[PDB]
Design a protein around this ligand. Structure first.
Ligand code: CLA
Ligand code: CLA
Ligand code: CLA
Ligand code: CLA
Ligand code: CLA
Ligand code: CLA
Ligand code: CLA
Ligand code: CLA
Ligand SMILES: CCCCCCCCCCCCCCCC(=O)OC[C@H](COP(=O)(O)OC[C@@H](O)CO)OC(=O)CCCCCCCCCCCCCCC
Ligand SMILES: CC1=C(/C=C/C(C)=C/C=C/C(C)=C/C=C/C=C(C)/C=C/C=C(C)/C=C/C2=C(C)CCCC2(C)C)C(C)(C)CCC1
Lengths: 154, 150, 188, 158, 137, 167
C-alpha cells in the first residue's frame, strides 16, 4: 500500500522486519497507531481553544489532563468502551493470512470513495502518510509540551 | 467440671427432651437446628470451638474441640466416600487411575497393581498392616502430647 | 458479516432463530462442549453417550438468554411497581425500600419459600433440558405454554418470538441500568 | 529452528525481529544456551527473592531479613567471590560437556544418549521448562525494577 | 519416554544406563578427574590426587583435634594430616606390591609406584599449603 | 406427551395403572431398579406418608379441645403439646407408639412379600371393612380420592411446620 513515494524514504525497511513474514499484522498495527495519533493531535490542539462544559474538565493543562480525567472518570469510561471495541475486534489476533479482510478495514465508507478502486488507493496512501506525520507530531508535541512550560504552541 | 456431683447430674436422656436444659450450658441450642440449615454455622461456636490447647481443669482436650473435629471428619469422610464409581457412571475407576500414572523413569507406571490388590489377599494385608502399624505409632505419639481424655 | 460487517459470520452460529443478526464477536457459540454434561455429569446412569446433536452450545446459550430475558422483564416491571408504592397487604411488606426489599424479605422468610418453589421449577426446567437430548423435540425456552396458539399460523408466532427476544434483551439492559443508577442515586 | 523445544505456546514460533531466520546452527545453539541459562538463573533468583521477602534468612544473616536489594549489601566481597567461583566451576564442567560430539543446547544430561527414543512428551516438558523460565526472567527483572523504583519492596503493597 | 535403558545396550550385564550412571554430566565430570583423565602420566595423576587430598585433610584435625583450643592447634592438625598421609602412602605401596605383581595405564607395578610417589609429594604439598593459608587468615 | 407437563415425555414405566397418576415424573424416579425401591416402595411410601399426614392435620385442628380422650387437658400447636401429653400420660402415648410400631414391623414383612410376589398390592393391608373389590370403578375412585386428599394433607402440614421455623 505504501508503494515507494517521496524522496527521503522510498521503500523504508532497513531492518527488513517485514521480510520475516506476516506483514498484514504490521500494517494493521501501523494503521491503528496512525488513527490514534491523528485523533491525539487533534485533541492536543483543541483543548487550548475549547474546553468541555463540566467544571471538572475546566482548567488543567494537556500534560496533566490524563491524570485528572483518570481520577474523574472520563479516562476510565473511555478505556472501558475502547476495551469493548478491541475485545470485539478479535479477528486480527489469530487469523491474519487466512482472513480475506484487508488490514485496518471496517465497513465504514459513507463517502463512498472506497467504491472507486483508484481513488481508494490514493486515499489509503494519504491516510498512511497523514497518520505517520501525525504520529511524529504527537510525539514531538508531548515531549516539547513537558519540556516547555506551556503546550499551546508546544 | 463445674463441680456438680454425679448424683445431681440429670440422666443423659434428660438432655434430649427439654432443650432449655442444654441451653443453660450452651446458649446456642435455643436457636435450634435452624442455623445449621440457614448456613449460619457461626451460631454454634458455643459448643463447636477451635480453641485447641488443653482444658485447665481436667487436663484433657476440650470436648467442644473434639466435637467439631469429629463433625468435620464426618463431613470429609462422607465426601470422600463418593469418589469411586460403583453403579452410576459418575465416580473414579481406580484401574484407569493407576494405569494413567506413568513417567519416563518407570516404564509402564502403575499398570497391573489393581489386579494385584484385587487377586491376592497377601498384598492387601501387607499394605493394611503397614498402615495400621504406622497409624498405631502415630496414635501413641499424638495421645501423650495432647491428652484427649479428662 | 451482519451487525458487525467486518468479521465473518460465525459458522457455528446459524442465522435461523429469532433475533439472529450474527452477533458473536467473541465466538462463544463456537465452543464445542455440548453443555448437557453440565446437568447430568459425564457417563451418568441416565446417558447413552448420545451425540451432542441438540444441547450443543447454542441451545444452552439460547435457553440461558431466554431465561435471563424473561426473568429480567419480570424483575424490571416488579421493581418499577414496588418503587411506586405497591407494598401489597400484610403490614410486614410495607415500610421497606426496594433496595432493602431483598435482604428484608430474606430475613423475613418468604424468600426461602419462593427459593424452594424456584428450586422445583428449575428442576422441571432441567428435566426439560435433559429431554431433547433423550430424543424429544423441545426447542430452547419452549415450555408448550401457548394460549395464544400462533404456532398454527407458523408466521405470526415467529414475529412474536423475535419481538420477545428484542424486548427481553432491552429489558435486561434496562433493569441492570436501573439497579445500578438507583443504587447510586434514588429516583422513580 | 522451529523443531527444537520451546515453540509450543499461544504465540507459536515468536521471532518478530529476525535473529534465527538466517542464523547458522552455531548461533541458534548459542541463543538457546543463553535463553536456558537466563531462564534457570531467573527461576532461582525469583525463588530466592521470595525466600528473602518472607523473612526466611539463614542463621548467619540474622540482621537483614526484609528487603533483598538491602540484603545484598550484607554479603561480604569474599562471599560474592565464592559465588563466582562456584558458578565458574559449573561453567567449566558445562564447557567440558560441550566438547562431546553429540551435544544439544542445554542438554547437560545427555538426553540424546539416554532416552530410548526421541519423544513428543520430552519436547513438551522441555517446553514447560522454557516457558516457566521465560516467565521467571520477566518476573525477576520486574521484581528488581519495582523494588528499585519503589523502595517499599514486595509483600509491602508493591 | 524411557530414560533407563540397559548399559552398553547389553540387557544381561549387571548395570543400568540411568541419568546418574551414563549422562553427559557424569561422563564429562569423571572423564576429567585425574584418576581417569586422558594424556596424564601416572605421576601427574598421583600428584593431583595428593594435592586434592592433603589440603583437604588438615582442617578436621586442626579444628576438632584435642589441641584445637590451644594456640598450637594448626600445627598439631598439620602433623596429624602428615602422619595420616604417610599411613595412606604405606597402604598404597603395599596394595601396589600385592595387586599388580606378575609409564603406562595406572594399573601396573611401575605405574602404581609412580602414582604413589606423586600422591605422597602432592599430599605433603596440600598439607603444607593448607597450613600456610590457615597460618594467617 | 405427559398430561401434566407436555414439554417432557411421559415415563415408560408409568402406564397410569396406579391411582393419582398424571404422568408427572420429570426426574424419572419410577425407573429405579437399584438399591431396592422400584416404584412399589415409592407408592407404599406415598400412601403411608399421606395417611399419617391426614391424621396429623385432623389432630392439629384440635377443634373439640378436649384432648381427644377425656383427661387430656390444654391446647397447644405442636411441640409443647406433644411434650405435655407425653408428660401427663406417658402410658397412653407409649401404647399408641407401640401400636404403630407393631403395624410397621408387620407392614415391612408385607412389603418384602409384595416385592417377591404380586399378591400384596401397594398400600394394601386388607383392612377394608366394606370389602369392596368386585367392580374396579368404585375401588379406583376411592383410592385416588384418598391419595389426592392425603396429598392435600401433606401440603397443609407443611404450611403448619413452616410457621415458627425461619430467620
Ligand atoms: C467512546 C465513546 C465515548 C466516550 C469517550 C464517552 C465519554 C464519557 N462517558 Mg460514555 N457512553 C458512550 C460513549 C462514550 N462516552 C455510549 C455509546 C454510551 C451508551 C449510550 C455511553 C454511556 C455512558 C454512561 C451510562 C455514562 C457515561 C459517562 C461518560 C463520561 C464520564 C464522566 C464521569 O466520570 O462522570 C462524572 C465521559 C465523558 C458517565 C457520565 O457521567 O456521563 C453522564 C456515565 O454515567 N457514558
Ligand atoms: C447422628 C447424630 C445426631 C442425632 C441422632 C441427632 C438427633 C437430634 N438432635 Mg442433634 N446434632 C447433631 C447430630 C445428631 N443429632 C450434630 C452433628 C449437630 C451439630 C450441628 C447437632 C445439633 C443439634 C442442635 C443444635 C439441636 C439438635 C437437636 C436434636 C434432636 C431433634 C432433631 C430434629 O429436630 O431434627 C429434625 C430431623 C432431621 C432434620 C432429620 C434429635 C434428638 C435439637 C434438640 O436437642 O432438641 C431435642 C437441637 O436443638 N441437634
Ligand atoms: C477443623 C476442625 C477441627 C478441629 C477443631 C479439630 C480439633 C482437634 N484435632 Mg483434628 N482434624 C481435623 C479438623 C479438626 N480437628 C481435620 C479436618 C483433620 C484431617 C487432617 C484432622 C486430623 C487430626 C489428627 C490426625 C489429630 C487431630 C487432633 C486434634 C486435637 C488437637 C488439639 C488441637 O488444637 O487441634 C488443632 C487441630 C489442627 C491444627 C488440625 C487442623 C487440620 C486442618 C483443618 C486440615 C484441613 C485439611 C483440608 C480440609 C484438606 C481438604 C482436601 C480435600 C478438599 C481434597 C483437637 C481436638 C489430634 C488429637 O486429637 O490427638 C489426640 C490428632 O492427633 N486432628
Ligand atoms: C421475576 C423477578 C422478581 C423477583 C425476584 C421479585 C422479588 C420480590 N418481589 Mg416482585 N414482582 C415481579 C417479579 C419479581 N419479584 C413481577 C413480575 C411483579 C408484577 C409486576 C412483581 C410485583 C411485586 C409487588 C407488587 C411486590 C413484590 C414484592 C417482592 C418481594 C417479595 C418476595 C417474597 O417472596 O415475599 C412474599 C421480593 C423482593 C413485594 C415486596 O415486599 O417488595 C416491596 C411487593 O409488595 N413484587
Ligand atoms: C435443574 C437442575 C438439575 C436437574 C433436573 C438435574 C437432573 C439430573 N441430575 Mg444433575 N446436577 C445439577 C442440576 C440438575 N441435574 C447441578 C447444578 C449439579 C451440580 C454440579 C448436578 C450434579 C449431578 C450429579 C453429580 C449427578 C446428577 C444426576 C442427575 C440425574 C438424577 C437426579 C438427580 O440427582 O438430580 C437432582 C438427573 C438426570 C445423577 C446422574 O446422572 O445419575 C446418576 C448424578 O450422578 N446431577
Ligand atoms: C414481550 C413479551 C413476550 C412475547 C411477545 C412472547 C412471545 C412468545 N412466548 Mg414468551 N414469555 C415472556 C414474554 C413474552 N413472550 C415472559 C415474560 C415469560 C416469562 C413468564 C415468557 C415465557 C414463555 C414460555 C415458558 C413459553 C413462551 C412462549 C412464547 C410463544 C408462544 C406464546 C404466545 O403467546 O405467543 C406470543 C411466543 C413466541 C412459548 C413458546 O416458545 O412457544 C411454544 C413457551 O413455551 N414464553
Ligand atoms: C437500558 C438503557 C439505558 C439508558 C437509556 C440509560 C440512560 C442513562 N444512564 Mg444508565 N446504565 C445502563 C443502561 C441505560 N442507561 C446500564 C445497562 C448500565 C450498567 C453499566 C448503566 C449504568 C449507568 C451509570 C453508572 C450511570 C448511568 C447514567 C445514565 C444517564 C447518563 C442516562 C439517563 C448516569 C446517571 O444517572 O447520571 C448521573 C450514571 O452515573 N447509567
Ligand atoms: C539467582 C540465584 C540467587 C542469588 C544470586 C542469591 C543470592 C543471595 N542469597 Mg538467595 N536463594 C536462592 C537463590 C539465590 N540467592 C534460592 C533459590 C534460595 C532458596 C533455597 C535462596 C535462599 C536464600 C536464603 C534463605 C538466604 C539467601 C541469602 C542470599 C545472599 C547471601 C548468599 C546466601 O546465603 O545464599 C544462600 C543460598 C542457599 C541457602 C541455597 C542456594 C541453593 C542453590 C541455588 C542451588 C545473596 C544476596 C541470605 C541472605 O543474605 O539473606 C537474605 C539468606 O539468608 N538466599
Ligand atoms: C518422600 C520421599 C522423598 C525423597 C524422594 C527423593 C526423590 C525421588 C524422586 O523424585 O523419584 C521420582 C522418579 C521419577 O519417576 P516418574 O516420575 O517417571 O514416575 C511416575 C510415577 O507416577 C510412577 O509411575 O522415580 C525414581 O527414579 C525412583 C528411584 C529413585 C532414585 C533416587 C532415590 C533417592 C532416595 C534417597 C533420598 C532421600 C531424601 C530424604 C528423604 C526424607
Ligand atoms: C562446591 C561444593 C561441592 C563440593 C566441593 C568439594 C569437593 C570441594 C573440594 C575442594 C578441594 C579438594 C580443594 C583442594 C584444594 C587443593 C589445593 C589448593 C592444593 C594445593 C597444592 C599446592 C599449593 C602444592 C604445593 C606444593 C607441592 C606440590 C609440594 C610441596 C611444595 C609446594 C608447597 C609448592 C558440592 C557440589 C558437592 C556441594 C556444594 C559445595
Amino acid at each position: 500500500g505504501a508503494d515507494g513515494p517521496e524522496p527521503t524514504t522510498k521503500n523504508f525497511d532497513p531492518l527488513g522486519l517485514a521480510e520475516k513474514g506476516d506483514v498484514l499484522f504490521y500494517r494493521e498495527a501501523e494503521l491503528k497507531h496512525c488513527r490514534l495519533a491523528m485523533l491525539a493531535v487533534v485533541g492536543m490542539v483543541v483543548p487550548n481553544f475549547v474546553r468541555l462544559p463540566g467544571d471538572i474538565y475546566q482548567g488543567v493543562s494537556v500534560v496533566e489532563a490524563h491524570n485528572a480525567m483518570v481520577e474523574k472518570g472520563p479516562m476510565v469510561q473511555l478505556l472501558f468502551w475502547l476495551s469493548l471495541f478491541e475485545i470485539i475486534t478479535a479477528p486480527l489476533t489469530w487469523n491474519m493470512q487466512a482472513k480475506d479482510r484487508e488490514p485496518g478495514d471496517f465497513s465504514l465508507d459513507p463517502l463512498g470513495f472506497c467504491k472507486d478502486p483508484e481513488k481508494k488507493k490514493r486515499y489509503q496512501l494519504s491516510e498512511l502518510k497523514n497518520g505517520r506525520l501525525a504520529m511524529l507530531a504527537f510525539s514531538g508535541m508531548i515531549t516539547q509540551a513537558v519540556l516547555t512550560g506551556h503546550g499551546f504552541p508546544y | 467440671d463445674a463441680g456438680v456431683a454425679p448424683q445431681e447430674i440429670p440422666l443423659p436422656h434428660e438432655f434430649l427432651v427439654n432443650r432449655d436444659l442444654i441451653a443453660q450450658l450452651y446458649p446456642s441450642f435455643s436457636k435450634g437446628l435452624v442455623p445449621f440449615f440457614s448456613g449460619n454455622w457461626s451460631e454454634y461456636s458455643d459448643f463447636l470451638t477451635f480453641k485447641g490447647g488443653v482444658n485447665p481443669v481436667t487436663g484433657g482436650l476440650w470436648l467442644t474441640d473434639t466435637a467439631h473435629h469429629h463433625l468435620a471428619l464426618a463431613v470429609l469422610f462422607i465426601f470422600a466416600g463418593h469418589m469411586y464409581r460403583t453403579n452410576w457412571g459418575i465416580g473414579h475407576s481406580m484401574k484407569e487411575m493407576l494405569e494413567a500414572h506413568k513417567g519416563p523413569f518407570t516404564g509402564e507406571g502403575h499398570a497391573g497393581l489393581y489386579e494385584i490388590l484385587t487377586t491376592s489377599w497377601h498384598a492387601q494385608l501387607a499394605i493394611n498392616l503397614a498402615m495400621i502399624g504406622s497409624l498405631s505409632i502415630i496414635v501413641a505419639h499424638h495421645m501423650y502430647a495432647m491428652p484427649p481424655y479428662p | 458479516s451482519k451487525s458487525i460487517p467486518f468479521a465473518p459470520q460465525p459458522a457455528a452460529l446459524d442465522g435461523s432463530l429469532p433475533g439472529d443478526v450474527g452477533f458473536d464477536p467473541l465466538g462463544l457459540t463456537s465452543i464445542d462442549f455440548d453443555w448437557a454434561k453440565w446437568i447430568v455429569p459425564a457417563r451418568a446412569s441416565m446417558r447413552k453417550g448420545d451425540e451432542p446433536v441438540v444441547v450443543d452450545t447454542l441451545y444452552w446459550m439460547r435457553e440461558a438468554e431466554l431465561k435471563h430475558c424473561r426473568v429480567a422483564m419480570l424483575a424490571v416491571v416488579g421493581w418499577l411497581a414496588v418503587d411506586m408504592g405497591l407494598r401489597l397487604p400484610g403490614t410486614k411488606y410495607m415500610g421497606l425500600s426496594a433496595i432493602s426489599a431483598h435482604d428484608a424479605m430474606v430475613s423475613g422468610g418468604n424468600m426461602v419459600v419462593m427459593l424452594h418453589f424456584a428450586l422445583l421449577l428449575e428442576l422441571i426446567n432441567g428435566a426439560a433440558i435433559f429431554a431433547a437430548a433423550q430424543g424429544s423435540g423441545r426447542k430452547p425456552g419452549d415450555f408448550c405454554l401457548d394460549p395464544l396458539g400462533l404456532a398454527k399460523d407458523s408466521a405470526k408466532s415467529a414475529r412474536y418470538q423475535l419481538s420477545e427476544v428484542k424486548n427481553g434483551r432491552l429489558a435486561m439492559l434496562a433493569f441492570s441500568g436501573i439497579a445500578t443508577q438507583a443504587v447510586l442515586t434514588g429516583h422513580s | 529452528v522451529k523443531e527444537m523445544p520451546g515453540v509450543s505456546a499461544p504465540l507459536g514460533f515468536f521471532d518478530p525481529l529476525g535473529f534465527a531466520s538466517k542464523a547458522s546452527p552455531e548461533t541458534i545453539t548459542k541463543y538457546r544456551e543463553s535463553e536456558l541459562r537466563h531462564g534457570r538463573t531467573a527461576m532461582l533468583a525469583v525463588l530466592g527473592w521470595a525466600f528473602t521477602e518472607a523473612g526466611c534468612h539463614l542463621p548467619v544473616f540474622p540482621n537483614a531479613g526484609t528487603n533483598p536489594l538491602a540484603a545484598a549489601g550484607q554479603v561480604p566481597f569474599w562471599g560474592w567471590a565464592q559465588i563466582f567461583a562456584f558458578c565458574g566451576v559449573i561453567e567449566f564442567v558445562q564447557a567440558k560437556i560441550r566438547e562431546r560430539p553429540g551435544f544439544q543446547a542445554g542438554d547437560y544430561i545427555g538426553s540424546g544418549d539416554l532416552m530410548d527414543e526421541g519423544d513428543d512428551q520430552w519436547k513438551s516438558f522441555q517446553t514447560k521448562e522454557l516457558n516457566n523460565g521465560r516467565l521467571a526472567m520477566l518476573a525477576s527483572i520486574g521484581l528488581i525494577g519495582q523494588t528499585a523504583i519503589f523502595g517499599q519492596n514486595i509483600l509491602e503493597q508493591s | 519416554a524411557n530414560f533407563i535403558k540397559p548399559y552398553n545396550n547389553d540387557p544381561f550385564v549387571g548395570h543400568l544406563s540411568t541419568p546418574v550412571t551414563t549422562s553427559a554430566a557424569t561422563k564429562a565430570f569423571l572423564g576429567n578427574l585425574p584418576a581417569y583423565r586422558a594424556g596424564l602420566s601416572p605421576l601427574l595423576r598421583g600428584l593431583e590426587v595428593g594435592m586434592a587430598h592433603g589440603y583437604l585433610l588438615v582442617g578436621p584435625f586442626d579444628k576438632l583435634g584435642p589441641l584445637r583450643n590451644s594456640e598450637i592447634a594448626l600445627l598439631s592438625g598439620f602433623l596429624s594430616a602428615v602422619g595420616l598421609i604417610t599411613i595412606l602412602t604405606l597402604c598404597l605401596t603395599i596394595y601396589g606390591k600385592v595387586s599388580f605383581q606378575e609409564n603406562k595405564d595406572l594399573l601396573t607395578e611401575d605405574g602404581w609406584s609412580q602414582f604413589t610417589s606423586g600422591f605422597l609429594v602432592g599430599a605433603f604439598g596440600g598439607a603444607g599449603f593448607a597450613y600456610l593459608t590457615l597460618l594467617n587468615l | 406427551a405427559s398430561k401434566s407437563l407436555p414439554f417432557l415425555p411421559k415415563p415408560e414405566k408409568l402406564d397410569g395403572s396406579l391411582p393419582g397418576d398424571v404422568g408427572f415424573d420429570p426426574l424419572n424416579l419410577s425407573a429405579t431398579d437399584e438399591l431396592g425401591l422400584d416404584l412399589y416402595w415409592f407408592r407404599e411410601a406415598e400412601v403411608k406418608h399421606g395417611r399419617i399426614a391426614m391424621l396429623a392435620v385432623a389432630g392439629v385442628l384440635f377443634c373439640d379441645q378436649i384432648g381427644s380422650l377425656p383427661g387430656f387437658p390444654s391446647g397447644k400447636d405442636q411441640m409443647d403439646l406433644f411434650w405435655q401429653v407425653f408428660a401427663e400420660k406417658p402410658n397412653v402415648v407409649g401404647a399408641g407408639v407401640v401400636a404403630v410400631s407393631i403395624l410397621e414391623f408387620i407392614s415391612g414383612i408385607a412389603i418384602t412379600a409384595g416385592r417377591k410376589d404380586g399378591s400384596r398390592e401397594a398400600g394394601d393391608f386388607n383392612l377394608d371393612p366394606f370389602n369392596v373389590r368386585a367392580d374396579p370403578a368404585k375401588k379406583a375412585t376411592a383410592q385416588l380420592q384418598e391419595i389426592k386428599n392425603g396429598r392435600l394433607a401433606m401440603l397443609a402440614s407443611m404450611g403448619m411446620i413452616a410457621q415458627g421455623m425461619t430467620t
